[PDB]
Amino acid sequence: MVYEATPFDPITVKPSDKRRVAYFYDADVGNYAYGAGHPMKPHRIRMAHSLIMNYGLYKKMEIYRAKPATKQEMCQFHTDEYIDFLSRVTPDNLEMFKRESVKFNVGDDCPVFDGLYEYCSISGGGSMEGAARLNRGKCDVAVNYAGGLHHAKKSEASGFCYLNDIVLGIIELLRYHPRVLYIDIDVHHGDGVEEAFYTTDRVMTCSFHKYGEFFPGTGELRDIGVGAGKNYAVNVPLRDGIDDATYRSVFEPVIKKIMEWYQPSAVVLQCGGDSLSGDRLGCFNLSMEGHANCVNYVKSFGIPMMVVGGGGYTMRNVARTWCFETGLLNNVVLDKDLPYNEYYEYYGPDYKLSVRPSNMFNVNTPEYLDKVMTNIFANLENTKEEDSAEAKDTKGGSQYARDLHV
Amino acid sequence: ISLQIPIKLKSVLVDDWEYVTKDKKICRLPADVTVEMVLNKYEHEVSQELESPGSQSQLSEYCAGLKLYFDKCLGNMLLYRLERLQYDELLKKSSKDQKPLVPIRIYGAIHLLRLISVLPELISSTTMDLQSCQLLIKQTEDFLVWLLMHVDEYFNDKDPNRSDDALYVNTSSQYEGVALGM
Amino acid sequence: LQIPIKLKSVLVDDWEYVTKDKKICRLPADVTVEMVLNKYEHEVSQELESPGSQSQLSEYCAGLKLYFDKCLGNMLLYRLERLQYDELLKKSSKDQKPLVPIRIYGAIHLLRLISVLPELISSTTMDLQSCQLLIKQTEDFLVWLLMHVDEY
Amino acid sequence: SLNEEVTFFEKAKRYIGNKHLYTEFLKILNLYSQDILDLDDLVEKVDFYLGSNKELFTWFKNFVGYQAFGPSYKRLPKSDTFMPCSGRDDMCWEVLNDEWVGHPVWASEDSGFIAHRKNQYEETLFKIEEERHEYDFYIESNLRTIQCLETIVNKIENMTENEKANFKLPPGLGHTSMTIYKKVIRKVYDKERGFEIIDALHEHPAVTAPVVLKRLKQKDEEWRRAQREWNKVWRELEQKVFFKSLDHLGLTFKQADKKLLTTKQLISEISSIKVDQTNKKIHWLTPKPKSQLDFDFPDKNIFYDILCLADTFITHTTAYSNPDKERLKDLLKYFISLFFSISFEKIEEIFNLFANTNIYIFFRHWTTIYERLLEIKQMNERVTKEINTRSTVTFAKDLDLLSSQLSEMGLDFVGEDAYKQVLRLSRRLINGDLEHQWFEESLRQAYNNKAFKLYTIDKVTQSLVKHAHTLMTDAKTAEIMALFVKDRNASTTSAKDQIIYRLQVRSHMSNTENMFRIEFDKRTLHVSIQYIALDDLTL
Amino acid sequence: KKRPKRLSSQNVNYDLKRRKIITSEGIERSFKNEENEDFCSACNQSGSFLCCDTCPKSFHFLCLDPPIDPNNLPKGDWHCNECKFKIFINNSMATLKKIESNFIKQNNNVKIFAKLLFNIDSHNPKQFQLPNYIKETFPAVKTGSRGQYSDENDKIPLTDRQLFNTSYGQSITKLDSYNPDTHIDSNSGKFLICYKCNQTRLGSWSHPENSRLIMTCDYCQTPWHLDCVPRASFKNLGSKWKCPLHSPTKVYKKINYKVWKKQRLINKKNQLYYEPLQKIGYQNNGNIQIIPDFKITQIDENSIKYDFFDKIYKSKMVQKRKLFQFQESLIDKL
Amino acid sequence: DFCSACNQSGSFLCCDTCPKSFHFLCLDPPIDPNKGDWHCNECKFKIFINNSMATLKKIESNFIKQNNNVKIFAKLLFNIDSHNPKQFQLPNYIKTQIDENSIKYDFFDKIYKSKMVQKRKLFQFQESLIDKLVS
Secondary structure, three states: OOOOOOOOOOOOOOOOOOOOEEEEOOOOHHHOOOOOOOOOOOOHHHHHHHHHOOOOHHHOOEEEEOOOOOHHHHOOOOOHHHHHHHOOOOOOOHHHHHHHHHHOOOOOOOOOOOOHHHHHHHHHHHHHHHHHHHHOOOOOEEEEOOOOOOOOOOOOOEOOEOOOHHHHHHHHHOOOOOOEEEEEOOOOOOHHHHHHOOOOOOEEEEEEEEOOOOOOOOOOOOOOOOHHHOOOEEEEEEOOOOOHHHHHHHHHHHHHHHHHHOOOOEEEEEOOOOOOOOOOOOOOOOOHHHHHHHHHHHHOOOOOEEEEOOOOOOHHHHHHHHHHHHHHHOOOOOOOEOOOOOOHHHOOOOOEOOOOOOOOOOOOOHHHHHHHHHHHHHHHHHHOOOOOOOOOOEOOOOOOOOOOOO | OOOOOOHHHHHHHHHHHHHHHHOOEEOOOOOOOOHHHHHHHHHHHHHOOOOOOOHHHHHHHHHHHHHHHHHHHOOOOOOOHHHHHHHHHHHHHHHHOOOOOOOOOOOOHHHHHHHHHHHHHHHHHOOOOHHHHHHHHHHHHHHHHHHHHOHHHHOOOOOOOOOOOOOOEEOOHHHHHHHOOO | OOOOOOOOHHHHHHHHHOOOOOOOOOOOOOOOHHHHHHHHHHHHOOOOOOOOOOHHHHHHHHHHHHHHHOOOOOOOOOHHHHHHHHHHHHHOOOOOOOOOOOOOOOOHHHHHHHHHHHHHHOOOOOOHHHHHHHHHHHHHHHHHHHOOOOOO | OOOOOOOHHHHHHHHHOOHHHHHHHHHHHHHHHOOOOOHHHHHHHHHHHOOOOHHHHHHHHHHHOOOOOOOOOEEOOOOOOOOOOOOOOHHHHHHOOOOEEOOHHHHOOOOOOOOOOOOHHHHHHHHHHHHHHHHHHHHHHHHHHHHHHHHHHHHHHOOOOHHHHOOOOOOOOOOOOOOHHHHHHHHHOOHHHHHHHHHHHHHOOOOOHHHHHHHHHHHHHHHHHHHHHHHHHHHHHHHOOHHHHHOOOHHHHHHHHHHOOOHHHHHHHHHHHHHOOOOOOOOOOOOOOOOOOOOOOOOOHHHHHHHHHHHHHHHHOOOOOHHHHHHHHHHHHHHHHHHOOOOOOOOOOOEOOEEOHHHHHHHHHHHHHHHHHHHHHHOHHHHHHHHHOOOOOHHHHHOOOOOOOOOOOOOOOOOOOHHHHHHHHHHHHHHOOOOHHHHHHHHHHHHOOOOHHHOOHHHHHHHHHHHHHHOOOOHHHHHHHHHHHHHOOOOOOOOOHHHHHHHHHHHOOOOOOOEEEEEEOOOOOOEEEEEEOOOOOOO | OOOOOOOOOOOOOOOOOOOOHHHHOOOOOOOOOOOOOOOEOOOOOOOOOEEOOOOOOEEOOOOOOOOOOOOOOOOOOOOOOOHHHHOOEOOOEOOOOOHHHHHHHOOOOOHHHHHHHHHOOOOOOOOOOOOOOOHHHOOOOEEOOOOOEEOOEOOOOOOOOOOOOOOOOOOOOOOHHHHHHHHEOOOOOOEOOOOOOOOOOOOOOOOHHHOOOEEEOOOOOOEEEHHHOOOOOOOOOOEOOOOOOOOOOOOOOOOOOOOOOOOOOOOHHHOOOEEOOOOOOOOOOOOEEEOOOOOEEEEOHHHHHHHHHHHHHHHHHHHHHHHHHHHHHHHHHO | OOEOOOOEOOOOOOOOOOOOOOOOOOOOOOOOOOOOOOOOHHHHHHHHHOOOOOOOOOHHHHHHHOOOOOOOOOOOOOOOOOOOOOOOOOOOOOOOOOHHHHHHHHHHHHHHHHHHHHHHHHHHHHHHHHHHHOO
């Protein structure tokens, strides 16, 4: 109800609940590049998998290689012409699609590269297979670091995002789970996910982002919802450099009230490297410990949840955070020492599993967050195809990426 | 030469300019205030309320000339660059439905006001007898006064976010991408 | 602009009777304009007047009184009434007293002010809204005077 | 009630205090009264106007009898809704929306966005990450293509020749991917030749596949040895930039502390919190009995540590004369021993004070040095336990990946008290043998960028001794401190000597100089400052 | 010790990044024998163009009288609409006469619109621009760099203020450095005072966390704390910020709805006009200004207070009448 | 000759500017018939401010501001001496620092009168409810 300014408590695992974790990964997701000077690069997933494949975490969880989504599946939310354009555009014939490159906003903000359709299909199939496995009870927590995009609209490509696999996973979750809650904990607010469920009540979005004429420009205490979606779109705008304790104090009570009033049957988490320490885009000061503590807080209630990797521009920090999140989801803590992997020389000079908080000024005053939370809780008072729905995915357990050499 | 226009219609035109260029809005293709019915209503209202001393022939000549001028004037100096794409879409639809396009019947009175505002420059563009210019300007001023007499019936402000019939709809991002930047 | 007519037959009776006996034989009126308007104010301002502002009615009474003070010898008399006004001016001159017409004239002099009011209202640059409010106030006053023919 | 509703407008006018805002308030009231604005928006607007006046706004609410979307998401017409997706069933059609959409170009009014500012060290790190990502992406794509092609050629060679001649393959090479091998071929060959090489590999394997695999193996060997070669440069560059990249405030602190420690800055701060009560708000509980109530001195040994720092800077400075140096040291020692209860313990390692601006600025410098050193002392045990248990990873130690020539010049913080170590480092910088940049790097490595306030400890100590020299050069401040010495009698005889004390310090002061009352209680080591603007001056 | 000048590793590429010498490698023996300007003439805008050769003028693909899709271009040296006359009808053949005078005989009873109907096709297409006899009658509206509308947005948008030092030129991500500059106005050297909590909240150099973010309104220069208004950061792009102490431009009522799109300013010989007629209620539909065609009424303070009290007491009266009707219904229930 | 203020011919009254006949006992101003040069009331208005000074300046703008609590017409209170008065004819359709205190007292009196009006109306409604209840 009021911002209590409680200090950052340690990350309690509370192992009373044991969650069967299904990690979805494809070896082909890291072999696609946007180009030099571009913030988005899917190569960060490969080292996130490598850190996962170097802690012995495969002995506590199920690895999965999802079948990539087809045109009949990504068109469950996107228009047919957008998917038809995306499956034929390559960076050698853009002049033949000069109209559709600016119609669907595929220019310089979202460039064209080889395997773009393949990467989008991989991400969509991963999200779909994770949601189908969560729906049938085959897993307790589904991990989808291999691709996840919140900026993608119905027929618009924006935010270095092309295919909104999050809404596809939510749609898959919507066929059995009635009430789904989408939690966003990064900067560059998920306007695509929020606007895709703005006028519905069975799915509501909660985003902790940055406002003040940032890149998305969407997210406000007045952005609440229209039609049947009134009081079913929650935005918590934050200023620059919110630290770990401030993020905990602004994250835990609103989540507690949200699930004490909405009580969702499914959770979609959008953890990412956008709200981490100093990277190419983003101004938050939330370190590894607070970012993992938010997810561990979400893990404390034992709700069947989705964790989806989103942004990330500095691959070492986002890989460290995703590895610690995977370890926390398996009811264990990881040592700060980094094991020897294929990207041993990639990480920082300390070579430790830690993202250092950049000592910069925090402008999130207690009274601003107090009035934001009072407005949010006032808005919260009223809250009281051929092979779709497919759980068919390859096991992919024979592969390994663990290094046992010098 | 010179035209005197009511100030309320000038404010309506400036609001149209704001809605198109700044607020990025376009008029509704299913117009209920179209140029043909508005001109016919004006002609009948000024013809059934007074006698015919021979000036009604001149008024019908002016109405027919305005209709013929709006038939082919809409695609040349009207139609801001944003709303050109809707015009192309309806032209393609009309050509697909084997029907020649008549913009008098499917465009509202805002474009008629735009034509009236531009009309002095078109008058100065061509070489005309001055008495003909004075007569045409007098008829245009009388029609503008009549339009001011029914300003609320044909021009009403309504937010498209709160109502579906507001003579102005929002534009999708695909519309902005195709119409502007290409 | 037009004023409703119910009791203006008294006005034409006076118009016929000014040439006979002037319709008034007492140079100071027994029932002057001051107490007539005071009884009107004590009658309407708490019976039919809605709560809120009564300043429009008080300002109407004050403006009517001040206009009557400026209506001296101007569209308010007949020829015999002009002679009566000359006599009043003469008898108000030896005692140097400023002759106010409110305390010397009766309700018969109000009707000629109200009847000529729309013609001179239309004779000046006056906003139509103010004309509507003024004719509404005069209609109210005449309606109040309809049930008070004793003063008439 | 009685004679209150008539005075509401005058009360509102005197409360607003601005004529333009009063005219706007009257315009809002009028447009409410024209049956245009409803009661709820009127009450909200008055709440924006009156606000903190709880009684007036509550009476307004009692008098008036009072008890849908944001700046984005404009609604599209239903004509554009009918965009066939061919994948939407009834549930997708009923749970998704096609009318209310918002775009980033609409939220910024087509004026763009401002990216967050990053220092050039962060840009160097971004360049390093881009280069490492490009090298590793090329390495991994080539290695995956080599794995696929080596499986292909093994399956070629282990069988006979008739199906070796005809092994027509679809796109994908029997794998789940479609174009990674195409990308590798296009990168290793020309643009116009990669297509034809891919075509002949698809339509005619077993003739060209082993040769292209050998070529890719040679290219991968070159790429691997070059990545090994350049990784040393990339590792050495990021070691000197990473702590600079994290320290967003440290590189600007050299200018920020110089800009915001002058006399005018402290005058403005203390006058701002002085006027922070003298405003439209009502006066309650003798407002402003103390200007700030925030100047306590909890620690003690910090007194002796700052005294040692000042002694070292005095022995280093060549500005003041040696008798001036000795008299400055004695004056600082006596001022510290008299303003507090310290009886000059060894350093070998309610009472008021009415004074001018110079003593105030000098004591402000003393307090800010004390506050920075106390903030360092607060996390001393935690940072000592962290620096004493920083276990280096064994594989990084064996591979010589550990950071060299950063703390190997004696700038390490391991095995010693961190607060004493930073005190010794500040003393060495005061004499000058340690580069200021290297001191900042050592502090960043030790305290994890939490000690950017100690970057200019030498400069603030220089300002400290400079303002202490101003305490002993003019007769006015000398008379002020002499009267301060005469004021401290180890006893409290206040409420009688205070008035003539104020008059006496007024006789040694100008008629426009701001008075500062430096109060200090006998216990709890508390000092507070009263900013007097000569309101006590009755002349 | 960095020294990246040598150690070039040209084996792959001397360039730190990816030079194209691997593309220059050519082992392929595996087969082994088994004048036009740059703006739209109708638009004055950049982008893709369709350029004619007979004239330098070029148009956009959509801004043409027969608006053509870029995916199906007309082949055969397409000419502009003006160019569809010079080397075509009415200028090349059947010339040596004024075709405008000859056009009059084709149509009748359109004599006042005859030569205009002749001249309509003799001109190139052009986007609609409001002529300089309508828009200059409003002193706040302006024509943008692309012909866009502009009335009260943030004037002179930043062009060189996007680059600065590590101190953020437009925001407060740094420490207390911008606090004494922003909290103190340069006109009088006095601390700016927030309207909600009447204080400065300047904080201190020692404790910058106590300071609060404050910026003035763009119209009335009202100092407002960022924590006293639903605002996240500074409004320095797009439109000017408006503090909540201003009269609304357009409002909606609902019990379909009304808009009341303000009044605007008419500066054509100051035509806006003023008139002081009777007080105590006027039905002026807003558009007032305070003294101590488009008609701005003249209204003083006592008229406003009398109208407000009249509205309040009328509301009390109708409420009382509704209560009377409810009690009458209750007594007819018995 | 005639008399527009007498509706008859009668006697003659001369005027220096635009001589229009009247009666000596029926002058437009109520002054002594026996005299020097006399201007008509419309002529007096013409020579007051319409000739050379205060003509572009509108005195009506000052006149509306200087009659407090009398605002029903500033026009008819101004143009009452701007023309020569005539005999009344039956029309054809029948056959500072102290003004603020004063207006504050007037506002208080109006609010009080509204308060007794509200109290009497309430009391009447309450009595009506009472004697309807006892039936």
